[PDB]
Amino acid sequence: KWWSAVVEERDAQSWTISVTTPADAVIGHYSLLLQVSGRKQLLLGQFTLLFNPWNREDAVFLKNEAQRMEYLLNQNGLIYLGTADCIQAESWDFGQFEGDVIDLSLRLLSKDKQVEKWSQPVHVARVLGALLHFLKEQRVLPTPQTQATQEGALLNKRRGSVPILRQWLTGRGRPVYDGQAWVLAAVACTVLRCLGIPARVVTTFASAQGTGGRLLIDEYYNEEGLQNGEGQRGRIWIFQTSTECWMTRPALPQGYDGWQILHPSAGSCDLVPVRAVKEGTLGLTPAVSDLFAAINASCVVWKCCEDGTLELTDSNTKYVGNNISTKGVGSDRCEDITQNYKYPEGSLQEKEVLERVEKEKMERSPLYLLLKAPSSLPLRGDAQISVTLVNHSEQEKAVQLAIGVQAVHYNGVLAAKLWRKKLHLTLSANLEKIITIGLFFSNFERNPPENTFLRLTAMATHSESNLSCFAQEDIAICRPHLAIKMPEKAEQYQPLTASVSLQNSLDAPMEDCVISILGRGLIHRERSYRFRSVWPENTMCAKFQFTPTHVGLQRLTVEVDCNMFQNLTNYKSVTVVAPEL
Amino acid sequence: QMEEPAAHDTEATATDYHTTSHPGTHKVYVELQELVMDEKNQELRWMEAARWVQLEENLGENGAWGRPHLSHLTFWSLLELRRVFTKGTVLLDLQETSLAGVANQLLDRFIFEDQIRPQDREELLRALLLKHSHAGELEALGGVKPAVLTRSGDPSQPLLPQHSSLETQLFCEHSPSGILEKIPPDSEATLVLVGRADFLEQPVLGFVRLQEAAELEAVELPVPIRFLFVLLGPEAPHIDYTQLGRAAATLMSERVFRIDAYMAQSRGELLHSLEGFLDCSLVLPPTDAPSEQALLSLVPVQRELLRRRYQ
Amino acid sequence: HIDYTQLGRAAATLMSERVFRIDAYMAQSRGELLHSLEGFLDCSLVLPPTDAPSEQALLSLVPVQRELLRRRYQSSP
């Protein structure tokens, strides 16, 4: 159970030792020395210590074997982006088994000086979370506010995490801008998997960041139906990434072993188990209430006016913090784990738990509408959007309808205004009124930004009274799909062919088509190729040939860069086996 | 109709593939092999021909290594070496453990830069993976004679003077343990392979530095391999692949150059180190002066050149 | 990579050879001058920079230039 050394077999000159290691020791670079009874010390070599989830008495232990492979031995992961309705997978290379990633992680860890807790990975997780959050605050650049679409391909292209770590530690690489600040979770997952703690990145859609302890968010809309001013303290973000670690809590009461969300504080970090979040144990960790409020919060809207006096309005309720998803186990399909955080909606358990929450905190329509909009918009395309209005009164009434479409960042930051329209209607004898309109890519007053989501706001103003109705929707923009053809199986040291095709579904001619391929264990670093013009109706097809070298399950990803858009990514997996003897 | 794209090159994202690790310092043992054919059986194979443990050691037709000696070069050797290194293909920090994978990646990179035509891939790959004999089996073979790769693969005699090399002729006409004692314990191997292919159109050079040293099973060397050179091409005037390999070995014999190769991250650094090496070399014309006095008059200029070398 | 002083020095040393002097004396076109210059470069001896020079090693090359001299006079009366 402690350090020991037993000679397994002895020969004339060769001796075999099977050295035992303690189940909980300080990790780092070690040195082995030998002392003779009389003579001096002689050095043997160096070695490195890591955790392992294969030991049942270790603090880190996972019962399943495949789950160890995905959460510790996998190097090609997926990140889920988009809105809650449409999900996009992006292939990421964590690359935790690179040559010098361990050196970077150890060198960064060496700035703690609490050496006695280096054998306890809870403290290690806390200090690394704090350090990475501070470094992210240090090294993330604000976006260049100037308009240069020609060089957008070199500003938003990602090649994995190893670089990000190299640029954050040494500052000798391509820096990262504020438009992609969700990579912090990926960096944390990479370094944690490097140290031997399994971790995984989850994505929460429509998460209310900002406010601490409140379940109410105020949003103020302009008189026209737009957003007056810019920014807010706490807003509803489009999505949020976070890191989850599998660990046992020895200092905590019984029943909290398992998954823990790592949440840094604006430095200092900490982590909280999932079940504690579900029950609502707010006195268990200072960072419980703020995280809990972000998964179920209410928003109310004030409609600004010319005088400036704000009046509360009746608006349609929106869902906050729903459809939590992550990478599936053993496959490439998304899996939802939102049930681990919340009770089922419209049930008892959520009702009593929430009412306990309110109690704990306090101790311390004649007309309306509903609207149908598509969940996505094809690039350079069009879509029809409908709204229906109903009134409930014996008399007629005049109404004023205002509709606006504007871009927004992924963290609730506005980008630009895109479209506006106003009309007037009259409802009589409580008859339904349906209005379907078309919206085109040519109707925009400017070019929408590269990484933004559209938000549409509809405002119905009642002429006689002051109460008025509001609604909004979130739309994403979908880009043309590209097809990849390649065999599911292949043999080592043999030629392999792949084909890629695309149909130009846009309305503009193609020029400067550049496509690149890459993949770990299949190709070298990356390879790029030119192309000719594609007209708005034709299809382009190409083929590539290579030779796999590393056995097992690999994958390769291609990306297309163009004049209309940048970084159009796709990927495909494959299995390669040893040659037949 | 299915169609292929045009190769494009850019340096937009090379920065992502630069390591922060120290390459480390090692001595290097340089080894040279060439493709020849043995009179016993009509089959091509690679013979070792020279080594650079401390000085250049040459192996004759009988199979006895001569006296280690100075590595003297020729003007043409360095001339075409620079000419082919100027537009060569390099593969840095490759992660492989077999000769087959290295060959496949190098062939793919050659096809990427149009150094070789696609239809020569199979033949070159097959020729690169033949069995690698050693010095001991020469007595089991009884001698070899030079040959050249052919489209059909059938060996033929080259249509060029096949006279023996002058270095062997002038330095030939217990050793493994001796060289193992001479080499430092921390030394890594560098391999150069030379040969001739008739269906090619231009000599091609390939430089490979592995991410870490490995002991390839295909060819036996006492120490793991870190660097590797490939020389191929058709027959041209004023060229000699043996002297090209000798010049490559002598270039590898420099401490500063191998340091630069260890820290190298692009072809430009290797090129710059190559011009730096070329600047500090001197040429001795054919003169009728006494040899010993001419060599003894060399000490001040060579001392100044070496003094200028270390900046 | 041009030093005009060294270019003149190389021209002078090229003029120093007896055989090249005879070639220049009988030359009737540029082709034979090119041939003689290429032959002179063929018998040229280049030595690289080293790390630990010694005269014991430097005396190991002594036969070659003698041979080279014979080769340089291989086509000479």
PDB file of C-alpha atoms in Angstrom, chain B residues 5-240:
ATOM      1  CA  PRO B   5      -8.094  20.027 -58.328  1.00  0.00           C
ATOM      2  CA  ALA B   6      -4.934  22.109 -58.687  1.00  0.00           C
ATOM      3  CA  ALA B   7      -2.362  21.983 -55.905  1.00  0.00           C
ATOM      4  CA  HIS B   8      -2.230  25.188 -53.882  1.00  0.00           C
ATOM      5  CA  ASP B   9       0.303  26.240 -51.257  1.00  0.00           C
ATOM      6  CA  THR B  10      -0.001  28.779 -48.443  1.00  0.00           C
ATOM      7  CA  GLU B  11       1.457  29.523 -45.014  1.00  0.00           C
ATOM      8  CA  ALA B  12      -1.717  30.738 -43.331  1.00  0.00           C
ATOM      9  CA  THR B  13      -1.648  28.211 -40.469  1.00  0.00           C
ATOM     10  CA  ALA B  14       1.908  26.898 -40.161  1.00  0.00           C
ATOM     11  CA  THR B  15       2.103  28.632 -36.765  1.00  0.00           C
ATOM     12  CA  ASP B  16      -0.286  26.038 -35.325  1.00  0.00           C
ATOM     13  CA  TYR B  17       2.302  23.262 -35.777  1.00  0.00           C
ATOM     14  CA  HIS B  18       5.333  24.602 -33.880  1.00  0.00           C
ATOM     15  CA  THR B  19       6.393  22.806 -30.709  1.00  0.00           C
ATOM     16  CA  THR B  20       7.517  24.544 -27.528  1.00  0.00           C
ATOM     17  CA  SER B  21       9.653  21.584 -26.446  1.00  0.00           C
ATOM     18  CA  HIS B  22      13.426  21.728 -26.456  1.00  0.00           C
ATOM     19  CA  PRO B  23      14.644  19.481 -29.314  1.00  0.00           C
ATOM     20  CA  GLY B  24      17.566  18.278 -27.195  1.00  0.00           C
ATOM     21  CA  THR B  25      21.207  17.760 -28.078  1.00  0.00           C
ATOM     22  CA  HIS B  26      22.598  14.513 -29.474  1.00  0.00           C
ATOM     23  CA  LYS B  27      25.497  13.234 -31.488  1.00  0.00           C
ATOM     24  CA  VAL B  28      24.586  11.650 -34.819  1.00  0.00           C
ATOM     25  CA  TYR B  29      25.969   8.567 -36.562  1.00  0.00           C
ATOM     26  CA  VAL B  30      25.614   8.886 -40.337  1.00  0.00           C
ATOM     27  CA  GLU B  31      24.990   5.844 -42.533  1.00  0.00           C
ATOM     28  CA  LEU B  32      24.877   5.519 -46.330  1.00  0.00           C
ATOM     29  CA  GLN B  33      23.168   2.839 -48.424  1.00  0.00           C
ATOM     30  CA  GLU B  34      22.739   2.478 -52.173  1.00  0.00           C
ATOM     31  CA  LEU B  35      20.609   0.407 -54.528  1.00  0.00           C
ATOM     32  CA  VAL B  36      22.711  -2.196 -56.383  1.00  0.00           C
ATOM     33  CA  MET B  37      22.268  -5.659 -57.879  1.00  0.00           C
ATOM     34  CA  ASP B  38      24.266  -8.778 -56.979  1.00  0.00           C
ATOM     35  CA  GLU B  39      25.790 -11.098 -59.582  1.00  0.00           C
ATOM     36  CA  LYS B  40      24.485 -14.168 -57.720  1.00  0.00           C
ATOM     37  CA  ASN B  41      20.732 -13.559 -58.067  1.00  0.00           C
ATOM     38  CA  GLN B  42      19.046 -11.008 -60.339  1.00  0.00           C
ATOM     39  CA  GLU B  43      17.531  -8.993 -57.497  1.00  0.00           C
ATOM     40  CA  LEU B  44      17.966  -5.405 -56.353  1.00  0.00           C
ATOM     41  CA  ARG B  45      18.940  -4.589 -52.785  1.00  0.00           C
ATOM     42  CA  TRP B  46      20.547  -1.922 -50.635  1.00  0.00           C
ATOM     43  CA  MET B  47      24.226  -2.161 -49.693  1.00  0.00           C
ATOM     44  CA  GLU B  48      25.822  -0.086 -46.985  1.00  0.00           C
ATOM     45  CA  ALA B  49      28.863   1.738 -48.313  1.00  0.00           C
ATOM     46  CA  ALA B  50      30.343   4.219 -45.821  1.00  0.00           C
ATOM     47  CA  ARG B  51      30.084   5.414 -42.243  1.00  0.00           C
ATOM     48  CA  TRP B  52      31.005   8.511 -40.244  1.00  0.00           C
ATOM     49  CA  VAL B  53      31.423   7.364 -36.631  1.00  0.00           C
ATOM     50  CA  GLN B  54      34.451   9.656 -36.201  1.00  0.00           C
ATOM     51  CA  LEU B  55      35.812   9.919 -39.746  1.00  0.00           C
ATOM     52  CA  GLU B  56      34.759   8.557 -43.111  1.00  0.00           C
ATOM     53  CA  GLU B  57      35.139   4.784 -43.355  1.00  0.00           C
ATOM     54  CA  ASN B  58      34.796   3.154 -46.772  1.00  0.00           C
ATOM     55  CA  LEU B  59      33.811  -0.411 -47.656  1.00  0.00           C
ATOM     56  CA  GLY B  60      35.389  -2.136 -50.645  1.00  0.00           C
ATOM     57  CA  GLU B  61      34.204  -4.891 -52.952  1.00  0.00           C
ATOM     58  CA  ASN B  62      35.945  -7.586 -50.897  1.00  0.00           C
ATOM     59  CA  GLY B  63      34.185  -6.457 -47.724  1.00  0.00           C
ATOM     60  CA  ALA B  64      36.890  -4.841 -45.560  1.00  0.00           C
ATOM     61  CA  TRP B  65      36.555  -1.355 -44.107  1.00  0.00           C
ATOM     62  CA  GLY B  66      39.570   0.847 -44.733  1.00  0.00           C
ATOM     63  CA  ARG B  67      41.212   3.582 -42.669  1.00  0.00           C
ATOM     64  CA  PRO B  68      38.928   6.316 -41.327  1.00  0.00           C
ATOM     65  CA  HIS B  69      39.907   9.543 -43.021  1.00  0.00           C
ATOM     66  CA  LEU B  70      38.920  13.067 -43.985  1.00  0.00           C
ATOM     67  CA  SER B  71      35.647  13.602 -45.839  1.00  0.00           C
ATOM     68  CA  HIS B  72      36.757  15.553 -48.907  1.00  0.00           C
ATOM     69  CA  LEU B  73      34.089  16.840 -51.286  1.00  0.00           C
ATOM     70  CA  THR B  74      33.805  17.870 -54.931  1.00  0.00           C
ATOM     71  CA  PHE B  75      32.493  21.033 -56.559  1.00  0.00           C
ATOM     72  CA  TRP B  76      29.725  19.287 -58.490  1.00  0.00           C
ATOM     73  CA  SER B  77      28.525  17.425 -55.393  1.00  0.00           C
ATOM     74  CA  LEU B  78      27.785  20.634 -53.495  1.00  0.00           C
ATOM     75  CA  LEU B  79      26.565  22.373 -56.674  1.00  0.00           C
ATOM     76  CA  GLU B  80      23.730  20.001 -57.523  1.00  0.00           C
ATOM     77  CA  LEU B  81      23.155  19.404 -53.786  1.00  0.00           C
ATOM     78  CA  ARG B  82      22.328  23.091 -53.343  1.00  0.00           C
ATOM     79  CA  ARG B  83      20.369  23.129 -56.601  1.00  0.00           C
ATOM     80  CA  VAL B  84      18.150  20.230 -55.528  1.00  0.00           C
ATOM     81  CA  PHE B  85      17.840  21.405 -51.902  1.00  0.00           C
ATOM     82  CA  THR B  86      16.600  24.805 -53.087  1.00  0.00           C
ATOM     83  CA  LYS B  87      13.295  23.346 -54.326  1.00  0.00           C
ATOM     84  CA  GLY B  88      13.205  20.172 -52.242  1.00  0.00           C
ATOM     85  CA  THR B  89      10.423  18.686 -50.137  1.00  0.00           C
ATOM     86  CA  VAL B  90      10.727  18.437 -46.349  1.00  0.00           C
ATOM     87  CA  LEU B  91       8.620  16.570 -43.779  1.00  0.00           C
ATOM     88  CA  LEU B  92       9.076  17.780 -40.206  1.00  0.00           C
ATOM     89  CA  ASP B  93       7.956  16.182 -36.922  1.00  0.00           C
ATOM     90  CA  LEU B  94       6.516  13.058 -38.525  1.00  0.00           C
ATOM     91  CA  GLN B  95       4.840  10.577 -36.159  1.00  0.00           C
ATOM     92  CA  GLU B  96       5.451   7.120 -37.624  1.00  0.00           C
ATOM     93  CA  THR B  97       7.053   3.858 -36.524  1.00  0.00           C
ATOM     94  CA  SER B  98       7.532   1.970 -39.812  1.00  0.00           C
ATOM     95  CA  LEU B  99       9.403   2.417 -43.069  1.00  0.00           C
ATOM     96  CA  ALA B 100       6.170   1.831 -45.002  1.00  0.00           C
ATOM     97  CA  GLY B 101       4.352   4.740 -43.368  1.00  0.00           C
ATOM     98  CA  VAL B 102       7.297   7.093 -43.857  1.00  0.00           C
ATOM     99  CA  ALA B 103       7.511   6.092 -47.516  1.00  0.00           C
ATOM    100  CA  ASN B 104       3.763   6.557 -48.026  1.00  0.00           C
ATOM    101  CA  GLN B 105       3.756  10.020 -46.454  1.00  0.00           C
ATOM    102  CA  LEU B 106       6.838  11.097 -48.413  1.00  0.00           C
ATOM    103  CA  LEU B 107       5.345   9.861 -51.691  1.00  0.00           C
ATOM    104  CA  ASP B 108       2.105  11.701 -50.935  1.00  0.00           C
ATOM    105  CA  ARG B 109       4.035  14.907 -50.266  1.00  0.00           C
ATOM    106  CA  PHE B 110       5.983  14.468 -53.515  1.00  0.00           C
ATOM    107  CA  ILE B 111       2.709  14.078 -55.413  1.00  0.00           C
ATOM    108  CA  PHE B 112       1.390  17.183 -53.643  1.00  0.00           C
ATOM    109  CA  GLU B 113       4.254  19.312 -54.997  1.00  0.00           C
ATOM    110  CA  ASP B 114       4.415  17.573 -58.422  1.00  0.00           C
ATOM    111  CA  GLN B 115       7.982  16.443 -57.761  1.00  0.00           C
ATOM    112  CA  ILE B 116       7.034  13.003 -59.131  1.00  0.00           C
ATOM    113  CA  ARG B 117       4.303  11.939 -61.539  1.00  0.00           C
ATOM    114  CA  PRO B 118       1.420   9.888 -60.074  1.00  0.00           C
ATOM    115  CA  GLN B 119       2.237   6.834 -62.205  1.00  0.00           C
ATOM    116  CA  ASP B 120       5.673   6.413 -60.581  1.00  0.00           C
ATOM    117  CA  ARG B 121       4.236   6.035 -57.063  1.00  0.00           C
ATOM    118  CA  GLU B 122       3.822   2.248 -57.062  1.00  0.00           C
ATOM    119  CA  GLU B 123       7.241   1.434 -58.515  1.00  0.00           C
ATOM    120  CA  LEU B 124       9.119   3.833 -56.233  1.00  0.00           C
ATOM    121  CA  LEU B 125       7.215   2.570 -53.191  1.00  0.00           C
ATOM    122  CA  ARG B 126       8.022  -1.042 -54.070  1.00  0.00           C
ATOM    123  CA  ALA B 127      11.690  -0.218 -54.673  1.00  0.00           C
ATOM    124  CA  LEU B 128      11.946   1.658 -51.366  1.00  0.00           C
ATOM    125  CA  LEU B 129      10.746  -1.345 -49.327  1.00  0.00           C
ATOM    126  CA  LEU B 130      13.204  -3.978 -50.545  1.00  0.00           C
ATOM    127  CA  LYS B 131      15.294  -5.955 -48.079  1.00  0.00           C
ATOM    128  CA  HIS B 132      18.261  -4.160 -46.503  1.00  0.00           C
ATOM    129  CA  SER B 133      21.321  -6.397 -46.224  1.00  0.00           C
ATOM    130  CA  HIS B 134      24.504  -5.485 -44.341  1.00  0.00           C
ATOM    131  CA  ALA B 135      28.276  -5.883 -44.587  1.00  0.00           C
ATOM    132  CA  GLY B 136      28.327  -9.462 -43.295  1.00  0.00           C
ATOM    133  CA  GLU B 137      26.126 -10.903 -46.044  1.00  0.00           C
ATOM    134  CA  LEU B 138      28.511  -9.613 -48.741  1.00  0.00           C
ATOM    135  CA  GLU B 139      30.710 -12.631 -48.040  1.00  0.00           C
ATOM    136  CA  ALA B 140      27.486 -14.631 -48.321  1.00  0.00           C
ATOM    137  CA  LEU B 141      26.866 -12.909 -51.676  1.00  0.00           C
ATOM    138  CA  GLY B 142      30.371 -12.604 -53.129  1.00  0.00           C
ATOM    139  CA  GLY B 143      30.091  -9.065 -54.469  1.00  0.00           C
ATOM    140  CA  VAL B 144      27.671  -6.690 -56.196  1.00  0.00           C
ATOM    141  CA  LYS B 145      27.630  -4.474 -59.277  1.00  0.00           C
ATOM    142  CA  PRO B 146      25.750  -1.187 -59.764  1.00  0.00           C
ATOM    143  CA  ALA B 147      22.286  -1.106 -61.321  1.00  0.00           C
ATOM    144  CA  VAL B 148      19.477   1.348 -62.071  1.00  0.00           C
ATOM    145  CA  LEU B 149      15.721   1.216 -61.524  1.00  0.00           C
ATOM    146  CA  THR B 150      13.736   0.514 -64.684  1.00  0.00           C
ATOM    147  CA  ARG B 151      10.110   0.927 -65.781  1.00  0.00           C
ATOM    148  CA  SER B 152       9.737  -2.845 -66.102  1.00  0.00           C
ATOM    149  CA  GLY B 153      11.751  -3.290 -62.899  1.00  0.00           C
ATOM    150  CA  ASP B 154      14.290  -5.473 -64.713  1.00  0.00           C
ATOM    151  CA  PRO B 155      17.825  -4.364 -63.758  1.00  0.00           C
ATOM    152  CA  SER B 156      20.211  -3.258 -66.477  1.00  0.00           C
ATOM    153  CA  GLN B 157      23.703  -1.913 -66.637  1.00  0.00           C
ATOM    154  CA  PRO B 158      23.818   1.901 -66.498  1.00  0.00           C
ATOM    155  CA  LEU B 159      24.831   3.698 -69.689  1.00  0.00           C
ATOM    156  CA  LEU B 160      27.488   5.641 -67.795  1.00  0.00           C
ATOM    157  CA  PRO B 161      31.083   4.878 -66.668  1.00  0.00           C
ATOM    158  CA  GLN B 162      30.786   2.296 -63.875  1.00  0.00           C
ATOM    159  CA  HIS B 163      34.368   2.682 -62.630  1.00  0.00           C
ATOM    160  CA  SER B 164      34.939   2.372 -58.895  1.00  0.00           C
ATOM    161  CA  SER B 165      34.954   5.408 -56.625  1.00  0.00           C
ATOM    162  CA  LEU B 166      38.252   7.160 -55.963  1.00  0.00           C
ATOM    163  CA  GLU B 167      37.776   7.371 -52.184  1.00  0.00           C
ATOM    164  CA  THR B 168      37.543   3.585 -51.886  1.00  0.00           C
ATOM    165  CA  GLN B 169      40.406   3.128 -54.363  1.00  0.00           C
ATOM    166  CA  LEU B 170      42.656   5.419 -52.304  1.00  0.00           C
ATOM    167  CA  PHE B 171      41.650   4.376 -48.770  1.00  0.00           C
ATOM    168  CA  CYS B 172      41.142   0.603 -49.153  1.00  0.00           C
ATOM    169  CA  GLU B 173      43.821  -0.716 -51.529  1.00  0.00           C
ATOM    170  CA  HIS B 174      36.767  -5.876 -34.065  1.00  0.00           C
ATOM    171  CA  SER B 175      35.434  -2.870 -35.982  1.00  0.00           C
ATOM    172  CA  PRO B 176      31.777  -2.972 -34.730  1.00  0.00           C
ATOM    173  CA  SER B 177      32.916  -3.049 -31.098  1.00  0.00           C
ATOM    174  CA  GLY B 178      35.467  -0.346 -31.887  1.00  0.00           C
ATOM    175  CA  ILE B 179      32.922   2.003 -33.430  1.00  0.00           C
ATOM    176  CA  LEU B 180      30.460   1.266 -30.609  1.00  0.00           C
ATOM    177  CA  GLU B 181      33.140   2.292 -28.115  1.00  0.00           C
ATOM    178  CA  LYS B 182      33.997   5.391 -30.168  1.00  0.00           C
ATOM    179  CA  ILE B 183      30.419   6.671 -30.485  1.00  0.00           C
ATOM    180  CA  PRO B 184      28.957   8.370 -27.389  1.00  0.00           C
ATOM    181  CA  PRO B 185      26.207   6.426 -25.590  1.00  0.00           C
ATOM    182  CA  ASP B 186      23.684   9.178 -26.414  1.00  0.00           C
ATOM    183  CA  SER B 187      23.834   9.176 -30.215  1.00  0.00           C
ATOM    184  CA  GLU B 188      21.104   8.874 -32.833  1.00  0.00           C
ATOM    185  CA  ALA B 189      21.212   7.574 -36.384  1.00  0.00           C
ATOM    186  CA  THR B 190      20.806   9.396 -39.688  1.00  0.00           C
ATOM    187  CA  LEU B 191      20.217   7.382 -42.858  1.00  0.00           C
ATOM    188  CA  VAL B 192      20.774   8.308 -46.498  1.00  0.00           C
ATOM    189  CA  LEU B 193      19.609   6.118 -49.390  1.00  0.00           C
ATOM    190  CA  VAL B 194      20.842   6.693 -52.932  1.00  0.00           C
ATOM    191  CA  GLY B 195      19.865   5.170 -56.251  1.00  0.00           C
ATOM    192  CA  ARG B 196      18.924   5.939 -59.831  1.00  0.00           C
ATOM    193  CA  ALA B 197      15.577   5.725 -61.640  1.00  0.00           C
ATOM    194  CA  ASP B 198      15.512   6.023 -65.420  1.00  0.00           C
ATOM    195  CA  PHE B 199      11.852   6.965 -65.915  1.00  0.00           C
ATOM    196  CA  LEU B 200      12.142  10.068 -63.722  1.00  0.00           C
ATOM    197  CA  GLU B 201      12.626  13.550 -65.170  1.00  0.00           C
ATOM    198  CA  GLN B 202      14.562  15.471 -62.491  1.00  0.00           C
ATOM    199  CA  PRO B 203      16.540  14.571 -59.356  1.00  0.00           C
ATOM    200  CA  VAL B 204      14.447  14.778 -56.194  1.00  0.00           C
ATOM    201  CA  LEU B 205      15.443  15.248 -52.554  1.00  0.00           C
ATOM    202  CA  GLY B 206      13.521  14.357 -49.424  1.00  0.00           C
ATOM    203  CA  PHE B 207      14.336  15.355 -45.844  1.00  0.00           C
ATOM    204  CA  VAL B 208      12.595  13.731 -42.871  1.00  0.00           C
ATOM    205  CA  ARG B 209      13.023  14.445 -39.158  1.00  0.00           C
ATOM    206  CA  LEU B 210      10.963  12.213 -36.891  1.00  0.00           C
ATOM    207  CA  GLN B 211       9.269  13.600 -33.800  1.00  0.00           C
ATOM    208  CA  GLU B 212      11.234  11.091 -31.711  1.00  0.00           C
ATOM    209  CA  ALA B 213      13.948   8.552 -32.448  1.00  0.00           C
ATOM    210  CA  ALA B 214      12.780   5.050 -33.359  1.00  0.00           C
ATOM    211  CA  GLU B 215      14.452   1.745 -34.224  1.00  0.00           C
ATOM    212  CA  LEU B 216      13.018   0.752 -37.591  1.00  0.00           C
ATOM    213  CA  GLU B 217      12.828  -3.007 -38.072  1.00  0.00           C
ATOM    214  CA  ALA B 218      13.446  -2.826 -41.834  1.00  0.00           C
ATOM    215  CA  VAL B 219      17.137  -1.910 -41.513  1.00  0.00           C
ATOM    216  CA  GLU B 220      19.311  -2.644 -38.479  1.00  0.00           C
ATOM    217  CA  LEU B 221      21.416   0.117 -36.954  1.00  0.00           C
ATOM    218  CA  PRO B 222      22.886   0.184 -33.427  1.00  0.00           C
ATOM    219  CA  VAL B 223      21.009   3.372 -32.485  1.00  0.00           C
ATOM    220  CA  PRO B 224      17.490   4.660 -33.209  1.00  0.00           C
ATOM    221  CA  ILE B 225      16.931   6.793 -36.299  1.00  0.00           C
ATOM    222  CA  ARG B 226      15.995  10.485 -36.170  1.00  0.00           C
ATOM    223  CA  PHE B 227      16.853  11.943 -39.595  1.00  0.00           C
ATOM    224  CA  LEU B 228      16.543  10.504 -43.082  1.00  0.00           C
ATOM    225  CA  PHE B 229      17.506  11.639 -46.588  1.00  0.00           C
ATOM    226  CA  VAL B 230      16.189  10.417 -49.943  1.00  0.00           C
ATOM    227  CA  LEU B 231      18.018  11.058 -53.232  1.00  0.00           C
ATOM    228  CA  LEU B 232      16.497   9.977 -56.540  1.00  0.00           C
ATOM    229  CA  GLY B 233      16.522  11.006 -60.174  1.00  0.00           C
ATOM    230  CA  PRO B 234      17.507  10.264 -63.767  1.00  0.00           C
ATOM    231  CA  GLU B 235      20.970  10.311 -65.340  1.00  0.00           C
ATOM    232  CA  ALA B 236      22.495  13.731 -66.042  1.00  0.00           C
ATOM    233  CA  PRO B 237      25.977  15.050 -66.836  1.00  0.00           C
ATOM    234  CA  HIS B 238      28.230  16.246 -64.003  1.00  0.00           C
ATOM    235  CA  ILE B 239      26.363  14.289 -61.297  1.00  0.00           C
ATOM    236  CA  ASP B 240      27.415  11.403 -59.039  1.00  0.00           C
TER     237      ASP B 240
END
